[PDB]
């Protein structure tokens, strides 16, 4: 049984012709005091020719805009060390440590979507004096710790039994480990912003950290120790699918400071030119 | 066998592709890159009374 | 089993591909949707909204609200040019930080026409007429109102309806234009001159201000997603 | 069969030994239609002031003369109200009708090739160098090939046999062309539509095509036949639009 | 102000990289096969009652290969002077002699000087 | 649902019979002065027999001619060096550095097509004194920088996060990395030639470089440094699909000099023979 | 999942294969087509166009336009052969650089017949008749007009209609012929002789010129793509 | 399931193959190696008046 799906293409509006005009219709004079954005197509101000316009606003929809993978965390962990807490990587989940996808997601106040998560794990042999060994392929475990579960204390913990937490074993040399994630939230939309506190006495922690608690991730080398040290770096890539977004906001201007807060330093609105009348002369023999 | 044959993205001036879903969860599907809808008057013209583009904005 | 054969491009990770992928939380039950107000369904809905344009971005006024307002006064100032700026909605410092500009800077090509709406912000008794002209590229910016008169202009009479829309049409040969514009895909330049001047009675101030709001017409479109140059970090946790 | 008349604007051309009329690729000049257009504003279409027969100065076919080339437009830029609209407007579009006129007696002999070349991008004399603009076009004064390999900075490598583009000068028969064989005809006509990869294009920046006149078989005559044989070129725009008006360019 | 038109050096070329207005220089060259007798460049200077050109136009005069080297036991079919560029000289052997090598030599130009091709033939007894 | 597509085969024209002739029809006498190419089948000049001709002009269509992969760039980059700009390859995109596909594409003035791009990346261990090591498989990143994006300054840049630029990670030992590319142009056809400038004062840059700006490509080793140096070479192969072509031109005669210009040295038209009457005698005991 | 099994030829890169492959720019919006004039749809449309043939490619005339024109004069020159050349449209120096030859040299086999059109380029008062003969291979080139008379010939009378077409038919045993021809797939040789001679009145020049244009008939075809030997480099950036 | 069964290339003197497109973009398809069309009269005979191959080219 085959089903035919209908997909309509949304072109942009053509240019209707026009001629001279001498009337009391002023399509130009308006009043911005009303919070209303003038709809003056060129055919209202000048004489235009009929132009069938085939262009499309497809690559600017929200799904085409956001559904592209982007890195959101990089972390390193060693096969052997003398710290036992550097033998595995760990981090709380948020899209907020890399400025690119942060700023991208933060043109909207509430974003509701599924995701496609990918991991790029790349090991290197640590620089030393006595290199040279035959180590077999490394395999890695990526465990997701929801908020509440027990978190590991070493790479030989019991928690890595991953009885109910989902976790991925991947043996280096194959295609990256990818999986898909539903809308795992308790609100009705991930709230990028939040003007409020956690405690009802109007104090506590301010803003985003209050709302979103999505747990942690813990990555480790399953193999075991290593004759000579090696260090692996894991990068995590988020790609939002089935994207819905609400209440847009002006794009960020000032540079980000930390992943907790929206604190900033004041910056200029834009960069300078010589005068207010300055247009450079570029037609010159 | 539970398929759906939709249309590809071609420009204007053998175009049908086939989709089958394999997983038991809609959070495993592809992305909906072929929905193009708009309603700018929500942000562009959010006013109680209409304004007709050829009458004075006041008066 | 079936004999398959792997083609090139196997086992790669292309950032902008959409395949299916196993759910890591099977039979999850998502939270019911909510008809929250104000849902965006395209980005050319954020770029059709007016935005105050920092025209007066001379030095010394870049962190002041004064950057937003064009000075205009009364007297025989017909020889002086009020303002003028290139049309480069993604590259000119005047535009690159508007809503139009900040939305363009995520894309690499842009076509369509633009709407610049001017708001006279002086007394209720000051009166003047202004000439607002756009000159398709091909020749240096006009330096007198007899040259700006020859362009694509409008004459805005200041009265009850305060503001006036100069709609920069789309004149180009290429269907599209780069956002990182060069002098091949140049777009022109707009310039503003007094047509008769400002006249005020006794007891009102003489120095008034205009303001300029940029938005995209209903035939604008952008394409070829790219990264924006405006955000940048130097380590994680930022 | 050999008589012909071409009436464009307020100008006429009569001929009595014409071979035929090459229409470039079976295609006639036409206006930009509404669905292939990209510019928003209304175009100027002067139609009789600009689509007429402009005659460029004439060149003397000597016994040892390699050839000549003109570049269109930038040849008609100082011709009437074509060369004025072409100044005041950013974008321009037009096809042409090229009539080349060279007459001799029945005691003379020779053979010219008359060939229109789209995008005839040319090659400097120093291989590691760049042409001028003067070295591509003198306006209505023709540039001249050379019977040997040329030297000098910024000047096109204009040995005839390569035609300045690096190809074989006998394969130019792939382009719209005619011959003037002083034993049969005395004029060649090529009707040239607007061939370019954008709907309209600027007129000062892009030499839309190149007209090359190359004598394959040279002149000859005997005891006191007429020594002076000139060649005259007439070009006439057709379906000429312009778009994007502003103040006039300057060079 | 504009100098008069430079002109046209036949068998040569004029390079005007900056126009012909006041104070503009132009250069002169000659094609492959000719020597440039005259000035190399010309400027737009002030001349009495106008602006005209510093130096007059030069001449490209044909480069000639020297007379072809005769061969013993041989002959040249209608030997001539004025052996310009790309022109040929044909040899032959005499009665009872056999011809070896390039039986005809063609004049080229190298380093701006006329030069024949490889050596003329030989006539064996 | 199965759909039947009809594919017509285009044979070449048969030879119709003929007999003696004595008439005023001269199918041979013509006049090339008209720019017209005589259509004289042999059956017009001599007596021919009817010949059903089954040959086909299929392998000479433009799609069959051009749709074959060909290399268009070769570049080397090292895992370790003391230059930090030789650790990654980089180049602006054009089909114009290899003479074969250049000359092939340049029988036409305007070529409009999609492409299929393939990469052949081959590493070698650099010759030295102390060889011998256990390095794991190398993996490479190939990033495409459209015109405008930020370009890397090292192999440890931020730009390699490839948030929106497309880029390929490929772990050596698999099938080559291939992808497909639309008609990414702003004109209506890629213009192999261009007789014009960039600036309106009729100066600037001349010819092709003006028109086509398609961005750059940057290749790097993801792994990291290496105990002992190694050097990888990347070759890029273009194969135009869905090919449309306009305004043919005579094939190039003189050899190419550079990828910027059509500059050349003059060459002979063809090579010599003894006389004009010379046909070699090959039937000899 | 499905049990597959990989056959030989897996994970290879064959230059001339056509598989599908992921788009690296999904949902791209290409520029609308343009009905540019002069579209090619086959290569045997570039090889059916006339092309002047460098017959007189003796040494000393290879970089001269003189290579293109055959000399012909008036007087008792009936003993002399005007021209003659092998039929080798991909290998003979006379042909290998025409449009026919340069299009063939991208292929390895060629079948079909050829059209050689001759143009008398002398006075309007000179008159002559010429014999143009093609000799299928099997015997040395004819050395007298009594032998050329026996071939497949035409007698061209010079008059108002200047040019005359000798259509070399396809006589062969193999359906095809190599482009790099040997003496197995040889094709013959054409030769031209005076039939009556040139006669001119007083006061016209005596030395005239012919010219020869080669094109492919409407039954020509080429096959087995190969590389062309005419282009070559010695490093990148060329 | 959105297939198309076209004909193979066989010579003249069990021949049908099957195609299915998997990607959402026509720039991902195969090549159109089975369109053979021609119009040489565009370059071969680009003249205003016709010439009939058995009449004098002039006169
Ligand atoms: C093994 C599986 C590990 C996968 C871990 C995926 C965690 C899912 C959390 C989804 C995160 C989304 C961000 O919090 C929102 N975009 C916030 O705006
Ligand atoms: C990672 C993906 C890297 C792929 C880069 C592909 C660049 C696409 C440009 C297409 C180039 C075509 C040539 O410019 C035209 N044939 C010019 O004639």
Curated annotation (Swiss-Prot), chain E:
Effect of residue 80 to H: In GUTI(-) antigen
Chain ranges passing through the membrane: none
Assembly with partners or alone: Monomer (major form) and non-disulfide-linked, covalent homodimer (minor form). Interacts with ADGRE5. (Microbial infection) Interacts with coxsackievirus A21, coxsackieviruses B1, B3 and B5 capsid proteins.
PTM characteristics: The Ser/Thr-rich domain is heavily O-glycosylated.
Protein name stated in the entry: Complement decay-accelerating factor
Domain comment as written in the entry: The first Sushi domain (SCR1) is not necessary for function. SCR2 and SCR4 provide the proper conformation for the active site on SCR3.
Reported function: This protein recognizes C4b and C3b fragments that condense with cell-surface hydroxyl or amino groups when nascent C4b and C3b are locally generated during C4 and c3 activation. Interaction of daf with cell-associated C4b and C3b polypeptides interferes with their ability to catalyze the conversion of C2 and factor B to enzymatically active C2a and Bb and thereby prevents the formation of C4b2a and C3bBb, the amplification convertases of the complement cascade. (Microbial infection) Acts as a receptor for Coxsackievirus A21, coxsackieviruses B1, B3 and B5.
Domain Sushi: 1-62, 63-125
Disulfide bonds: 3-44, 30-60, 65-107, 93-123
Effect of residue 107 to S: In CHAPLE; increased complement activation
Family: Belongs to the receptors of complement activation (RCA) family.
Portion of the parent chain present: 161 to 285 of 381
Disease with which this protein is associated in UniProt: Complement hyperactivation, angiopathic thrombosis, and protein-losing enteropathy: An autosomal recessive disease characterized by abdominal pain and diarrhea, primary intestinal lymphangiectasia, edema due to hypoproteinemia, malabsorption, and less frequently, bowel inflammation, recurrent infections, and angiopathic thromboembolic disease. Patients' T lymphocytes show increased complement activation causing surface deposition of complement and the generation of soluble C5a.
Source lineage: Eukaryota, Metazoa, Chordata, Craniata, Vertebrata
Tissue: Expressed on the plasma membranes of all cell types that are in intimate contact with plasma complement proteins. It is also found on the surfaces of epithelial cells lining extracellular compartments, and variants of the molecule are present in body fluids and in extracellular matrix.
């Amino acid at each position: 049984v085959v089903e035919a799906v209908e997909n309509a293409v949304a072109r942009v509006a053509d240019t209707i012709s026009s001629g001279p005009s001498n009337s009391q219709a002023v399509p130009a004079l308006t009043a911005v005091e009303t919070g209303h954005t003038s709809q003056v197509t060129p055919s209202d101000t000048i004489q235009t020719r009929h132009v069938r316009n085939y262009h499309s606003r497809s690559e600017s929809s929200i799904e085409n805009f956001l559904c592209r993978s982007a890195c959101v965390y990089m972390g390193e962990y060693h096969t052997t060390n003398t710290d036992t807490s550097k033998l595995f990587a760990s981090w709380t989940i948020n899209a907020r440590r890399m400025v690119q996808m942060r700023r991208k997601l933060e043109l909207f106040t509430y974003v509701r979507f599924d995701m496609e998560v990918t991991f790029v794990i790349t090991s290197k042999q640590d620089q030393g004096t006595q290199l040279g060994q035959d180590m077999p392929p490394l395999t890695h475990q990526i465990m997701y710790i929801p908020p509440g579960g027990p978190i590991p204390k070493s790479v030989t913990d019991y928690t890595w039994q991953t009885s109910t937490n989902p976790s991925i074993f991947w043996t280096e040399g194959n295609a990256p480990p990818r999986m898909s994630i539903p809308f795992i939230s308790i609100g009705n939309a991930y709230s990028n912003f939040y003007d409020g506190w956690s405690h009802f006495s109007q104090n506590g922690v301010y803003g985003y950290n209050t709302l979103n608690h999505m747990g942690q991730i813990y990555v480790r080398h399953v193999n075991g120790s290593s004759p000579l040290p090696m260090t692996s770096t894991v990068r995590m890539y988020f790609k939002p699918k089935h994207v819905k977004v609400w209440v847009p906001r002006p794009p960020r201007l000032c540079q980000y400071k930390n992943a907790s807060t929206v604190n900033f330093t004041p910056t200029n609105i834009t960069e300078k030119r010589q005068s207010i009348n300055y247009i450079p002369e570029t037609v010159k023999p | 066998m539970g398929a759906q044959v939709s249309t590809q993205k071609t420009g204007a001036h053998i175009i049908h592709y086939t989709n089958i879903n394999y997983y038991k969860d809609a959070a495993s599907n592809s992305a909906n890159r072929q929905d193009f809808s708009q309603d700018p008057g929500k942000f562009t013209e959010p006013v109680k009374d209409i304004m007709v583009k050829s009458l004075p904005a006041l008066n | 089993g079936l004999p398959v054969m792997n083609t090139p491009g196997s086992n790669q990770f292309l950032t902008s591909d959409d395949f299916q992928s196993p759910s890591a939380m099977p039979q999850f039950d998502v939270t019911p949707e909510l008809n929250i107000p104000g849902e965006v369904q395209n980005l050319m809905e954020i770029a059709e909204v007016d935005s105050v344009v920092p025209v007066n971005n001379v030095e010394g006024k870049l962190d002041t609200m004064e950057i937003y307002r064009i000075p205009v006064q009364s007297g025989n100032h017909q020889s002086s040019q009020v303002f003028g700026f290139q049309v480069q909605p993604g590259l000119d410092n005047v535009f690159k930080h508007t809503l139009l500009g900040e939305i363009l800077n995520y894309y690499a090509h842009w076509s369509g026409s633009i709407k610049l709406t001017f708001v006279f912000c002086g007394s209720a008794m000051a009166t003047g007429k202004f000439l607002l002209a756009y000159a398709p590229p091909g020749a240096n910016a006009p330096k007198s109102r007899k040259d700006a008169m020859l362009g694509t202009h409008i004459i805005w009479d200041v009265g009850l309806q305060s503001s006036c829309v100069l709609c920069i049409p789309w004149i180009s040969q290429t269907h599209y234009r780069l956002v990182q514009q060069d002098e091949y895909t140049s777009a022109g330049n707009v310039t503003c001159w007094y047509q008769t001047g400002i006249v005020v009675p006794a007891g009102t101030p003489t120095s008034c201000s205009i303001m300029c709001f940029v938005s995209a017409c209903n035939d604008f479109s952008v394409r070829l997603l790219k990264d924006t140059p405006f955000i940048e970090q130097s380590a994680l946790l930022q | 069969d050999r008589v012909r008349s071409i009436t464009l604007g307020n100008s006429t051309i009569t001929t009595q030994e014409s071979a035929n009329v090459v229409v470039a690729y079976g295609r006639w000049p036409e206006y930009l239609k509404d669905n292939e257009a990209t510019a928003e504003d209304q175009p100027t279409q002067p139609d009789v002031a600009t689509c007429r027969f402009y005659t460029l100065e004439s060149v003397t076919w000597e016994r040892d003369s390699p050839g000549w080339w003109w570049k269109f437009p930038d040849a008609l830029k100082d011709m009437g109200l074509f060369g004025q609209n072409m100044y005041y407007h950013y974008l321009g579009r037009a096809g042409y009708t090229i009539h080349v006129q060279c007459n001799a007696s029945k005691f003379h002999q020779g053979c010219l090739m008359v060939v229109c070349v789209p995008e005839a991008e040319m090659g400097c004399s120093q291989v590691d160098g760049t042409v001028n603009e003067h070295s591509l076009s003198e306006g209505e004064t023709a540039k001249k090939f050379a019977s040997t390999s040329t030297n000098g900075t910024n000047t096109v490598q204009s040995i005839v046999t390569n035609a300045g583009m690096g190809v074989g000068v006998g394969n130019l028969t792939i382009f719209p062309h005619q011959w003037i064989n002083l034993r049969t005809n005395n004029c060649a006509t090529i009707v040239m539509p607007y061939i370019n990869n954008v709907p309209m294009d600027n007129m000062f920046r892009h030499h839309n095509f190149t007209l090359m006149i190359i004598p394959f078989v040279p002149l000859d005559y005997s005891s006191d036949s007429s020594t002076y044989v000139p060649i005259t070129v007439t070009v006439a725009p057709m379906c000429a639009e312009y778009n994007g008006l502003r103040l006039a360019t300057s060079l | 102000k504009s100098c008069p038109n430079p002109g046209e050096i036949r068998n040569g070329q004029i390079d005007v990289p900056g126009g012909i207005l006041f104070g503009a220089t132009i250069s002169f060259s000659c094609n492959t096969g000719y020597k440039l007798f005259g000035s190399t460049s010309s400027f737009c200077l002030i001349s009495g009652s106008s602006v005209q050109w510093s130096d007059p136009l030069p001449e490209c005069r044909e480069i000639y290969c020297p007379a072809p080297p005769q061969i013993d036991n041989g002959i040249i079919q209608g030997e001539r002077d004025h052996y310009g560029y790309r022109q040929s000289v044909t040899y032959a052997c005499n009665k009872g002699f056999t011809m070896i090598g390039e039986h005809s030599i063609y004049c080229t130009v190298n380093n701006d000087e006329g030069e024949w091709s490889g050596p003329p033939p030989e006539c064996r007894g």
